[PDB]
Amino acid sequence: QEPYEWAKHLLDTKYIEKYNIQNSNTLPSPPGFQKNQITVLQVQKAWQIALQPAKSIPMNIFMSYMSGTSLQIIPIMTALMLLSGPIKAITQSQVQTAMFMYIVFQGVLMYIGYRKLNSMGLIPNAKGDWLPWERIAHYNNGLQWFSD
Amino acid sequence: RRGTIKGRLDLAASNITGFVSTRTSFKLYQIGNFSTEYPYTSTTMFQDDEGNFEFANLPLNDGVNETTYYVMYPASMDFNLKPNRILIEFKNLENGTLQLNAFKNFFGREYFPSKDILQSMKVHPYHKAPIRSYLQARNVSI
Amino acid sequence: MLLDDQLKYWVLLPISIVMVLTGVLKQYIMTLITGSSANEAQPRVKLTEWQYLQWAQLLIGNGGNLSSDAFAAKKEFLVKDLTEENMASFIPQTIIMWWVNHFFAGFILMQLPFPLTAKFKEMLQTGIICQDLDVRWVSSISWYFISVLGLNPVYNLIGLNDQQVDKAMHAMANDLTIIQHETCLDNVEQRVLKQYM
Amino acid sequence: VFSDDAFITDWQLANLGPWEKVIPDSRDRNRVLILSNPTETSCLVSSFNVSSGQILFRNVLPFTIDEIQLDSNDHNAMVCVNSSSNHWQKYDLHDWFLLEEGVDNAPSTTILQGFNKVEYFHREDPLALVLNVNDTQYMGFSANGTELIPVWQRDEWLTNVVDYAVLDVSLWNAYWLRLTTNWNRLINLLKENQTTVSDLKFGFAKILIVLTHDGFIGGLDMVNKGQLIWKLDLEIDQGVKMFWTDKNHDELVVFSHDGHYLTIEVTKDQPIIKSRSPLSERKTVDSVIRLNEHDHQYLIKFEDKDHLLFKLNSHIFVTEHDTNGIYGYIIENDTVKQTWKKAVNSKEKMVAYSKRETTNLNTLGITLGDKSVLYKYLYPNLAAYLIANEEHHTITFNLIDTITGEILITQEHKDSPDFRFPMDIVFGEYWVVYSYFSSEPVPEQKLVVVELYESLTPDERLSNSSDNFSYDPLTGHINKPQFQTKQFIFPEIIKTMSISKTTDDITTKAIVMELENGQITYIPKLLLNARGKPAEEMAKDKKKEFMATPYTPVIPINDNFIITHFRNLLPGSDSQLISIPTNLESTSIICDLGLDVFCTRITPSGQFDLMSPTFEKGKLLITIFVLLVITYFIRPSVSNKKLKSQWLI
Amino acid sequence: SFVSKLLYTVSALVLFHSGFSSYEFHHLLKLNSLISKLPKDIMYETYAGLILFVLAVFTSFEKLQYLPIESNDGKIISQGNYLKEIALNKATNVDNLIGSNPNGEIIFTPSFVDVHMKRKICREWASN
Amino acid sequence: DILQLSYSDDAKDAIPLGTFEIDSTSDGNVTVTTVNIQDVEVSGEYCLNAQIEGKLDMPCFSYMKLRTPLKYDLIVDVDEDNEVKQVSLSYDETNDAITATVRYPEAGPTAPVTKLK
Amino acid sequence: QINATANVVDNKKRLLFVQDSSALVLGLVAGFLQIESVHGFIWFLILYNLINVIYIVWICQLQPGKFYQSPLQDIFFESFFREITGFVMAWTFGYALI
Amino acid sequence: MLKDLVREKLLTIMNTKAYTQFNPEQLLQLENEMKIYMKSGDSALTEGNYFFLMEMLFYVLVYRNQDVDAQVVYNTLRDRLGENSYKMVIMKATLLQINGNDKGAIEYLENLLNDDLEYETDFVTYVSIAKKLIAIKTTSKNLSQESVLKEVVALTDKFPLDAELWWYASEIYFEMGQFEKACYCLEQVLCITPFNYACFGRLSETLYYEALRSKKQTKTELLEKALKNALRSVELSELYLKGWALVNIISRELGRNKQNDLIKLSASKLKEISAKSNNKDKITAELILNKI
Ligand SMILES: *[C@@H]1O[C@H](CO)[C@@H](O)[C@H](O)[C@H]1NC(C)=O
Ligand SMILES: *[C@@H]1O[C@H](CO)[C@@H](O)[C@H](O)[C@H]1NC(C)=O
Ligand SMILES: *[C@@H]1O[C@H](CO)[C@@H](O)[C@H](O)[C@H]1NC(C)=O
Ligand SMILES: *[C@@H]1O[C@H](CO)[C@@H](O)[C@H](O)[C@H]1NC(C)=O
Ligand SMILES: *[C@@H]1O[C@H](CO)[C@@H](O)[C@H](O)[C@H]1NC(C)=O
Ligand SMILES: *[C@@H]1O[C@H](CO)[C@@H](O)[C@H](O)[C@H]1NC(C)=O
């Protein structure tokens, strides 16, 4: 084959001198021919602290309207999301406090989900969960009993 | 001396004439401060096709203004019955007579009110009449 | 415990078939209902004003491709032209949950291969009030709960993709004026020398 | 759950005794009146179709055969005169309407081929001849065609059932054998293509090996209608007990009241008596107790209160109840030495007794709403019994240790009870239910539940389940029970009670109660809650378990739980109510041997192991096909809308 | 590929036969309990079906081959990869090897095509 | 009266373990007092008797594997008229001897039926 | 590094196909073998991560960094709960069907 | 699996619109391969890809003077979709344009744009119908490049962020000596599509042409910008032949030589492109390397 047309016109430096210019009188031109740090700090403070309100009393009343029963998988799955999402999601001297506050209140939302799962009874704390793996008192151990 | 309790379970009055008489029994159990060793217990069946049962020769407490009570259990393996139990008062009056009264009661309620208070039980005439012989319906359709 | 095999063959596969068919139906209904796209059907002048807003936004996002002598001119022209000129998915889940608890309630369907705690006996066994049944022997709503979590591989494998104006323009011009130009053409030579050598 | 199972899942062998006297009905002439089953205090009077072979009704009358006679002025009415107290009753013969009765004056009353036949019965000149063929067999012939065809047949060998028994009826070469066998099976399936089976699987198919009072052995098929598979006359007097020899259920040992044991090999078709040897001291056998099935010895108790350790082909404690007291015995090496006696005084009488049934352990305790365990008192070797005191008129529930024999729990009921009514104890895994009759709250029937726990405070297990500890209950060093009691009323008088036995004892134990009118109901143990708070206090406080039933101390008679639906079932006075564990955990066979063997299958927790007969398969396939049709019809609409999104937008 | 569909069907047959054999064994064990666990030929057949299914999944990946857009001969361009490279330096190597331009709907001007000029050039090429 | 508790072997005679005193309603209940205990070495399986010489004889009420530190509790089950119905021997870890306790039988439950209001 | 997002989405789609088929058939085999709880979950962890290692060796050709940005987060994570729920579903299906 | 290779080849010619720049021999081979493929299996080819390939087949048949077969293809696409999408409007405009009727196509597109002003659909429809109207006004009226530039500038005044319009404007500006306006339009395309390495290469080429046309002290000042844009074109594409050729040529023209660490890298990358890339890239890279 023959090579590209952009490169036949690129090697010869005399072609660009041969390349003339058209007259431009009525030729149309194309169309068109610190506070940033403080606002960045406020945007990052809303990124780390204004996400906290969702984790606040709105979410507390949202988990208080589920009544603490195991009979649906939507409260259990949303409590698992409240457990795992904060777990998955966990001028320089001003944003470190909000960066610590964000993960602290994500841990607070994780504790809210833990409180929901514990008020459901879905956490193996008491002896009713470890009752099937609890052994038997062997009473006889060398005698037999038969009755009339 | 000895009282007699009449009665009538009207089965021909509801077109249930085809039935076995031995599937319906009537038990009588004495309560209310008797004077024998054991309280009097009897069990009778029907006497006619009309349904008129009868208890007879019941021992009574002999004395003026003295009562002797009997719980009557009309039971049937065929039909439900509307008075589950019937209290029977057999008061020996000074009138020279022997007043027989009967009071309706359902299963699971006491027969005499507490001495502190009172709600009375619905009085039954006299034969008596266990009404509502609708069938017992053992079988559950599925 | 001797269970009925016909309980398996008539509860496990029908609940799974009905759940994959209602997942298919929910995907098809949510494609047919959501007719909107990334664009909308607007008149031409609203599209032109949104195109100038998005031109200022694209200049903000892609000023790194230009030099300073061109980004400054485009920023000046853009400033001069800007200043002057949720329950739809839980209703099928409720319908399928009611249909499982209506058609298949009253019998233990199967045994789990993993034991849970006794509190799951209050959710995985419904029509059985027996207290000595440990939480392995489960009803059909347990298979609903297990299939709800685990049908996303089956949804993927069958090919389903598994379940006013002037204020905004002046705000975009104010976000454009305060930007710091950080072009990607300054030290592109040392970056090419680091990448390919 | 019941209407498609009535007269199908259950059956009744409606038996009379040997027909002592047969009286023709003058009002019908197609009916007949049979006196039968002559006991020393009662007699079964029945009306019976001589043309159909079915009993029209039965009545156990308190008068004997000699006392029951026929009225002289009315031959369609029988007068029954108890002459020891001059109590007479006149009964109609057609519908058994009780006519006149009294104590004073009784009315003037009168007095009443086949293969080796022995007697005639009901010689009626138009039709309906009855041949008493064998000693306990009655055939019935009619003459529709003047040829005397056999119309009905009846075998009254089963009268007074004593005992029973239930017969249940290198690697590459293996891989290539499996592959070739499955290949040949698939070939035969694709070449062939181009209840009575599930009852064997579910354990419903069983054989009752009923032993009667006359010395007969039967073979009543459970999944049939009680069809006698085989029968055997042992030619003994008053057979007493019957046990299997080995674990494979191939041979029985039937003991008799004369001191003879018989080993009977039971085949699939018909059994043969294999041994008829006597005992060592054969005077009169009272009851036999089987000890330690793997080492086949027995504890034959005699009528003279003697004992005999018997054997055919460390400590062993045996408790034995009587009408006056409960006694203990130890078997040291081969001797039977008595160990304790909880005897009663002259005014008391042991009226009920039940050993603790060896149930399979599933849960060690009861999980409450706080997930706090109330541990069951699962100590074995318990026995519960009732002592009726006529001096104080009390019911004394006692719970004994049966190894040392100490009374763990005592309970007095001064409810003015009646001892002329039936009283029964049944013992569950950790609980006792006893029924008696009294009149102090109300004059109806009382049912008391005693649930035994290790402690009444939750999460307080008092038993030592450690590996380095072994309990020795002969020392007495066992934990003591703490009980919770409730009393329930019940409208019908309960004659006897039993516990429903299932396979692994998973489902809820139903206290199956046979009532005095012949009906059999059952109350689940969930409905008899001993830690029951009433429905006011049940909803407020949360310490109850999941769906814990409240304390309902009334117990209305649920007609869905009457398992003798519309049947004229008549068990006698012995009338043992037995339960048989099958496979398929949810169900249990309830039989009621003793005058009429009735057998049914109950599901106390519902039939959760088996698919319902009215399972909506049609609506299931309709919903599946509707979803398939809706997807197949809405798929081109989506395939067109995505194309319109690709092109128009 | 062909080996992928072959191992897919072979693993499906082996897993179905081994599941049917394990069903027969575990439903004969339930009738014999009214100890003696799975015979190792069924276990090794389930493992053979699992290994053949894993090989059918991994041999479904064919190495990425492309035809060149301009030239039409017996040459096929392959970088020897099973997946597509994410780095834009190496992602556009596919577009540069075959002769395409990913922003060709902008670069080639497909809206401003003089249709009569294309028809004239094609007609003069067919006439010659 | 006086309850003599005495263990015994199979065929041989009784060996006394103690004597206790039943007193009928001095001021309260009929609860026992211990007159005499017996410091006799006893070990093995024995039949215990609880003979009262005036009112009630019990040939053997319990069969226990007795040890020499007899940490038992003589439960005297009594009646409404304060007569000795039964005698039993419970185990008690914190007992150090055989102390006798009178047990009155528990009042059985009564059902709350509907009343007449 | 400037990524081409179509190649990222396509590589994640192929990896999701591998992980979905592997999780479902591992659940079917764990149900055919009648594996109980801890042995079943350890079985799934071992064989699922072995399939991911075979994906890195055979498909990614010992360099998953040119095919997945953050390959440890993309291959071994980001579908772990999804594949373990698919394994539990196919595990219960096969365990109940056998 | 040759059918999948032909499918992906036809989808890349469809999506990148390479048939616009094809030879009549290449259009003949494309029509033959397209009619062989589209009269075959159709298993992995989706429905939308099938109708996009049929639109591409329509344009190949239109370019190859096969207007009857193109009318058949447009009739099939109208029987599926109808004359409601923008693409079917452009196809109807081409069918009006090739059957005489150039003023009829102008009237149709102008009256549709008078319908497509108020209560319109999305911006792609208006900008595509208006770009086709500019193309038909260029062909029929025989417009000069100033008037075509006036129409494209009017279509960028209203409706910006259509990089096709700015690219066509830069093409006409580069056909003239107006290199600064061309560079402004190319920088606008870089604002729209940021990873357009072909646009970085075209901007480097326009700055190199302006630097050689200047021939002054500003020549090196423009060659600096040309080298930086050519280096950005190869930081977005390793095997970009135009970018590495421009890096080599602008580095030789800037003053640095004798393997001054970038001419060496550009020569190595052009040798790699001549080694592994296609025959057009190989011949072009041997043309770039073997000069002087
Ligand atoms: C108790 O007896 C008296 C007479 O002595 C009687 O009046 C009273 O009615 C009796 N009690 C009851 C509840 O009947
Ligand atoms: C009649 O009855 C009342 C109360 O029931 C009693 O006080 C009175 O003495 C009675 N009369 C006679 C004459 O006994
Ligand atoms: C008895 O009382 C009734 C009504 O209470 C009355 O009619 C009757 O006359 C009384 N008897 C006598 C003998 O007066
Ligand atoms: C006759 O009556 C007495 C008491 O009424 C009873 O004890 C006896 O048993 C009766 N006789 C018969 C034969 O039943
Ligand atoms: C059975 O008895 C009923 C009523 O007594 C009668 O109608 C029926 O005909 C009898 N059966 C036969 C076969 O005669
Ligand atoms: C009577 O009994 C004998 C057994 O000795 C049996 O063979 C015969 O068949 C019986 N008679 C009838 C009619 O069944």
XYZ file of C-alpha atoms in Angstrom, chain D residues 253-256 259-263 274-280 282 310 312:
19
model
C -43.328 -64.752 74.139
C -46.928 -64.980 75.334
C -47.335 -65.647 79.041
C -50.570 -67.019 80.466
C -47.897 -70.175 84.399
C -47.046 -71.148 80.817
C -44.902 -69.182 78.382
C -45.243 -69.775 74.644
C -42.665 -68.785 72.054
C -42.647 -73.051 68.580
C -42.427 -73.663 72.332
C -45.014 -74.234 75.067
C -42.802 -74.770 78.107
C -43.965 -73.997 81.670
C -42.318 -71.809 84.316
C -40.414 -72.789 87.468
C -46.327 -72.043 87.820
C -37.192 -65.661 83.981
C -35.037 -67.336 77.468
